[PDB]
Amino acid sequence: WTPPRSPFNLVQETLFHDPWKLLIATIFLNRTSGKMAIPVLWKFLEKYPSAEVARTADWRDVSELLKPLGLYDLRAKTIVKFSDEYLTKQWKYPIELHGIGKYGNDSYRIFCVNEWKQVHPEAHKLNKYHDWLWENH
DNA sequence: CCAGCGGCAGC
DNA sequence: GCTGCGCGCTGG
Incomplete structure (x- = not known):
């Protein structure tokens, strides 16, 4: 399973x-x-290239990087927690992990696994991709 | 100028 | 279902 490149340009x-x-x-x-x-x-992925490094990150440093994005302290605490569980907990779907909900599960089930047919996403740029998948099928 | 709008936990 | 987190993009 290799997710195809789309005219929608999702970062996924x-x-x-x-x-x-x-x-x-x-x-x-x-x-x-x-x-x-x-x-x-x-910018984040240059300072913190892996879950192994982000897991040892000071959330407060991670927050200074996020300032222009909003939800900077909330998401910073989230990036240090999720990355920890990601490597420490046993999980099948990332939804089990802290900071990942429907949207992140929907992305993983489409791009990281052959389960796009079974997914019903809500996020805007995601439904454009998913519908384009069924349409071009 | 300006106000609406681009997920998640935790209760 | 409800609520707090948060900035800057956009477009009238």
Whole structure:
């Protein structure tokens, strides 16, 4: 299973090989415009390239990086918690993990696994992709 | 100028 | 279902 490249340009299309990066991408996109989030996502992934490093991060430092995005302290605490569980808990679907809900589960089930047919997403840029999947099928 | 709008936990 | 978190994008 390889999710196809779409005319919609979801960030999920580039990060599916590393689930952690793709899931962090969804967290950056919680009620935050893609325009601001994605640039700042790359900035994060240079300072914190893995779940192994983010897990030892000081949430307060992670928060200074997020300031322009909003929900900066909430999401910072979230990035240090999720990354910890991601490597420490046994999980099948990321929904089990702190900070990941329907949206992040929907992205993982489409891009990181062959389960797109079984998914009913709600997030806007995601339904455009998912419908495009059924349409081009 | 300006106000509406781009998920999650925890109760 | 309800509520707090939060900035800047956009478009009249």
